[model samples]
Target chain A: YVLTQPPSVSVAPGQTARITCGGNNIGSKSVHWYQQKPGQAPVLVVYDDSDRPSGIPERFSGSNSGNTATLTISRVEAGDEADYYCQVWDSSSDHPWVFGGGTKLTVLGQPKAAPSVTLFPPSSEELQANKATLVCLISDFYPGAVTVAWKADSSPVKAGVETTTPSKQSNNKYAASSYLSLTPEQWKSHRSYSCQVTHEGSTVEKTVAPT
Target chain B: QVQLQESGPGLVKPSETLSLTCTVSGGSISSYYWSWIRQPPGKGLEWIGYIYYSGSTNYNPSLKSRVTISVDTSKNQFSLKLSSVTAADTAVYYCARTQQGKRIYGVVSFGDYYYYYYMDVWGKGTTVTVSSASTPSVFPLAPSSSGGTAALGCLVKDYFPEPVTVSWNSGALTSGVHTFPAVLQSSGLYSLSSVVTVPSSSLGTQTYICNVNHKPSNTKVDKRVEP
Candidate 1:
């Protein structure tokens, strides 16, 4: 059977909490933990419910006791929200990372902020054998670490001959941009391009694209 | 499944830009977004970004400032440009694409679904670096009719990331000789230049060979010189 944590949890900075998922008729090998920040893909935090991947901080950890698997965050920070999930790998099927229902983590007492985005110029409707530059700006974020991406004809933008700029913003907020060059035939036939941004704690995204 | 390959120089000088190209085969470019990504040796992958069959693009914010990604549909290829780079930018770069329908957009307007995420496909990688040191050179020695000296010179680029050897051969003698050290340029290419002088009375016309051996795929290139 499938298992999962509650829909949401609240914790303060430096606080500790446990997120639990309950499942049955499954072996330990099937269990894994993942972290999903706002507007980003789920990142695998623990596989087999105990081992952490490289570059993961020690403050976040996982363990399975009895029928319940637990994800423990030792010192919660403002950036810890977005969402968390647990899944059991199914060797019986071809799919990998079978995800659990997600849990949204909320940082208690954080203030609400406005969502803003920026677009870089030369926004031509047609790409005529020249490069096109586009930027996405998100501002006034409280615990700022944002993710930006591009998409074509509603699909994830694949790597092209392009460059990206880091997110920079005044105060504690941030902004970032991506550049691309393509031929006119490519632009005329393709449908649309999009820029997406996700802040750490927020579940929603701020996006922009050419018309 | 179709396969792809990248062919280019492995090294460049600092303060100079590095350029590379990727060629695709066994696949159609008619319906896919081609991409470029990079990883420093032993570092996590960085999404340099991608381009659609049309010319639209999205880039990793971290590199958006200095990176330029483009596509050439006519050639079934793409290229990358990073300007005024430093040693920190050295990496093994790759080209790849997402399987059809495997692509999705996470951020939607008031009515869209999901958000931004990860790449699902990749290509084999090629490495390039930027530096400022030159490489060593090798030379061969020859024998002369009179008591004169024989001098030889050899040169190879740095940043090859391979084992290099030089050998000297004369009328019945095949001997290996130590060449000068290499210098790395700011552009990350290596240059090895060396000169050898031997007593003409002791040696005759000699041949010097410089061989370079690289790994993962053992690739070799040889240069020959005579004195």
Candidate 2:
């Protein structure tokens, strides 16, 4: 069996937070930490929870205190949107394996915040006479179910699209993107244009005005 | 209990794609994740990811860029796709699931998790080589079904020095009458092909088989192709 301190934690955005875990049979050297964003897959964070590897932000660090393993994320960002987990390698039994129980981390400060969405090519501005492509970028979403679409006139728009939920991102957030193409004239007449992004049974819309 | 079987060609040329299908039996397609895992001839295993019963998927981060797993619930089977594959992708692939259970440790809680470990059940593995060999040779094909005939074919290449034989059997063939087709490679140093056809009537209730008998120790490997 493993032990983790501060069974749960609540932290303000941009503030650092720490989590620690202990196991009876496994040494501190065998512990590791993972981050699983809401509705997203888990990611290996701190192996043995103390040593930070290259490419990992300095904000995220791990260390061992006696038999306990600790995970620290400095300047905790708002996108950190999932539960964290601690794991240890078990070698005592005939079958050696890895043990992990997930810990959920709640990112406070943003209640009912509009889901963040960014479109490429900056503003939807395009060549007046030629066909143009518009890409919708959606990221840091908690809960995997999200639908993205290019809408014209609100009646309900049909456009070719693709969607994906990539695994854990540094702050425990998940991301996805979609793309669609339309002519400049189509955009001019497309009054009240918007990109509808839906997730967790909630729908968030971002509208674009004609330039 | 549910059982699954995989079927596909056993040989492919370099730069060509390899395809295989797993057929499921005796189970519903609800609440389960169908997955594919493969292991090299002597290496460790790798999880290729899984597809939900509804067709949604979660792929291995390392392979998500190239691998695609899809399901055909109506047929109770799924398919795997690996594009622009090289020799490095060669391995025995298996489809299975993680045992279900739940355990709590420390402050972390995992509600009803699926465990992934050794695959307790597996379909007979089929190997496909991406190398070109000389002319094809028809070795001794395994016997036909109890009431049907059998068709057999073989190809020998230079890479494999040992001569191989093919045959047929009812159950797993521990021992049997092995037939080897003549070699017809242009290189003369290696390569050949063989074909054997058996009547369906003679194979009634019996399984048509294919056996590859290698040289030196004469280790015989056989596969039952038809019921």
Q: Please compute the TM-score of chain B alone for each predicted structure, in the order given.
A: 0.57, 0.57
lDDT of 2: 0.53
Task: Write the residue-wise lDDT of candidate 1 on A1-211 in tens digits.
Answer: 3565687888876899678777664433445666755433345577655777666789888887677888899888777775777766443433322445667787675554644543332233223325343333334555545566666667777564232333323232333333343444555456665666665644433333333
lDDT of each: 0.55, 0.53
lDDT at residue A148 of model 2 (Cα atoms)? 76
lDDT measured at residue A7 in model 2 versus the true structure, 0 to 100 = 49
TM-score, candidate 2, chain B alone: 0.57
lDDT of 1 by residue, B1-227 (tens): 55667654566788788787888888766577776767675443455767787777766666778888788889888888887888988887877663222112344454433222223344566767665643222222211121275544344333354234444342122322324344334444344433344555535454455454433234555546543
The weakest ten consecutive residues by lDDT in model 2 chain A span: A120-129
Candidate 2 deviant stretches above 4 angstroms: A1-211, B106-119, B132-227
- Superposition error at B118 for model 2 (Å): 6.8
Stretches of candidate 1 exceeding 4 Å from the true structure: A1-211, B99-112, B115-120, B135-227
Count of backbone clashes, every candidate in sequence: 68, 39
